[PDB]
């Protein structure tokens, strides 16, 4: 009976720690994935605007080499 009592209290400790562990790892995975997605959204927007500035330069370089 005494050994069973020790197994019960150890199982309770183990389950509390496992719940803490799994919530910590789930949170960390989410908070990384969200950062990566947002930065990729902003990088695509900036890249589209820089491609626009490049096209405006080719236009002015077209008008100069017309004359």
């Amino acid at each position: 009976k005494r050994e069973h009592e020790r197994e019960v209290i150890q199982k309770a400790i183990e389950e509390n720690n496992n719940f803490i562990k799994m919530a910590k790892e789930k949170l960390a995975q989410k908070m990384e994935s969200n950062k990566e997605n947002r930065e990729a959204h902003l990088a695509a927007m900036l890249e589209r605007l820089q491609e626009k500035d490049k096209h405006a330069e080719e236009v002015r370089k077209n008008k100069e080499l017309k004359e």
Binding site: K1, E5, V8, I9, Q10, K11, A12, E15
Partner: protein, 423 residues
């Protein structure tokens, strides 16, 4: 000689305190612990329950246990609260939340060693310890779970001593939480294995007595506990006064318990008081055997008596007592098993209780007690088949398997009672 008393949890400590008030009054001990009686019969066996300290002071041989402080503060402030030894109060802070697993496996385990230290200090100074009595309820968390843990450790360290309990059994009619049937099933499993005698005190019966017979529209815990304390006084009278008998807890057990697992007793009391008409011996005898005076809500006509003890208190004719006890046995012979001859025993004590001229206490070992366990088993099953409220327990580390085993043990106890009822 010496008895050690233990009270655990809210219920246990309230009824325990009431017990010590009543018997301290009978022995002429006041709240300060000074003797102010009129008769040497009060002191001749005082040492059974009280230690003598310096100054001819008498101190109860009593240990007070809880996982929360509240109720022991109420004891310490109660009317006789100063009589208990301060070092005998052992309390935690966390509480047990009406949860047997907290009492037995987690919160309770942290405190049990410090409780055993005080038990050992009391036993060490006993001239000749006869054994132990515990007061507790089965429906909560501390008295139920930690009480049965304590019972197990005491058996392990004092394996040849008698262990006796006064155990309050739960009812939906007087209920604090829905989980009471779980806590009670887990506790009975322990008692079947580790006690010699258990007095079954059913809150259902105490309520019905207060309501129907004593006429009280709203019974409080105080009203129920008054009956409990009067019953316990009755049942300890033969050890406590010079009544010829040369007995100890073991000789009483040997006389009352024919099979080791079937040791659950049904108490009764007469007359029932909340008057002036004195009571004839026929009247005490008729009422003590009446279903309505029983403290466990079981019909004794639904079973048979394995054994009976009757204790009469007051000045009365022993001839008339014998005649009436014989009358009830001879006219109702079919309810008494024929294969244990002379299974009804009678004691008389000269000293009456406070406020009565004559009284009787009843102790029955009847197979009808199976009715109580069946009740609890049905309430258990109705939840357990859907696993309702189980997460409170598995969160403290218990598996379902332990519940299944406890349920099986209690159905076996019921089957045994039925085997001896049909013989």
């Amino acid at each position: 000689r010496e008895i050690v008393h233990i009270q655990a949890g809210q219920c246990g400590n309230q009824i325990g305190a009431k017990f010590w008030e009543v018997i301290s009054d009978e022995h002429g001990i006041d709240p300060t612990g000074s003797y102010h009686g009129d008769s040497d019969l009060q002191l001749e066996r005082i040492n059974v329950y009280y230690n003598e300290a310096a100054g001819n002071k008498y101190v109860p041989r009593a240990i007070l246990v809880d996982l929360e402080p509240g109720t022991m503060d109420s004891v310490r402030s109660g009317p006789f609260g100063q009589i208990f030894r301060p070092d005998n109060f052992v309390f935690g802070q966390s509480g047990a939340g009406n949860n047997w697993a907290k009492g037995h496996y987690t919160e309770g385990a942290e405190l049990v060693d410090s409780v055993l230290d005080v038990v050992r200090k009391e036993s060490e100074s006993c001239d000749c310890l006869q054994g132990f009595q515990l007061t507790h309820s089965l429906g909560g968390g501390t008295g139920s779970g930690m009480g049965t843990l304590l019972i197990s450790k005491i058996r392990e360290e004092y394996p040849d001593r008698i262990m006796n309990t006064f155990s309050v059994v739960p009812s939906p009619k007087v209920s604090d939480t829905v989980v009471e049937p779980y806590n009670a099933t887990l506790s009975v499993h322990q008692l079947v294995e580790n006690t010699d005698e258990t007095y079954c005190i059913d809150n259902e019966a105490l309520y019905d007595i207060c309501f129907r017979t004593l006429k009280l529209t709203t019974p409080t815990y105080g009203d129920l506990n008054h009956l409990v304390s009067a019953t316990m006084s009755g049942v300890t009278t033969c050890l406590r006064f010079p009544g010829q008998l040369n007995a100890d807890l073991r000789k009483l057990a040997v006389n009352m318990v024919p099979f080791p697992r079937l040791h659950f007793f049904m108490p009764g009391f007469a007359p029932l008081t909340s008057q002036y008409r004195a009571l004839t011996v026929p009247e005490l005898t008729q009422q003590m055997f009446d279903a309505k005076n029983m403290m466990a809500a079981c019909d004794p006509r639904h079973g048979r008596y394995l054994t009976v003890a009757a204790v009469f208190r007051g000045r009365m004719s022993m001839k008339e007592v014998d005649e009436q006890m014989l009358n009830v046995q001879n006219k109702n012979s079919s309810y008494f098993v024929e294969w244990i001859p002379n299974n009804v025993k009678t004691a008389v004590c000269d000293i009456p209780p406070r406020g009565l001229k004559m009284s009787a206490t009843f102790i029955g070992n009847s197979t009808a007690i199976q009715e109580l366990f069946k009740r609890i088993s049905e309430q258990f099953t109705a939840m357990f088949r859907r696993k309702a409220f189980l997460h409170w327990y598995t969160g403290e580390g218990m598996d379902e398997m332990e519940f299944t085993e406890a349920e099986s043990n209690m159905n076996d106890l019921v089957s045994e009672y039925q085997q001896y009822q049909d013989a």
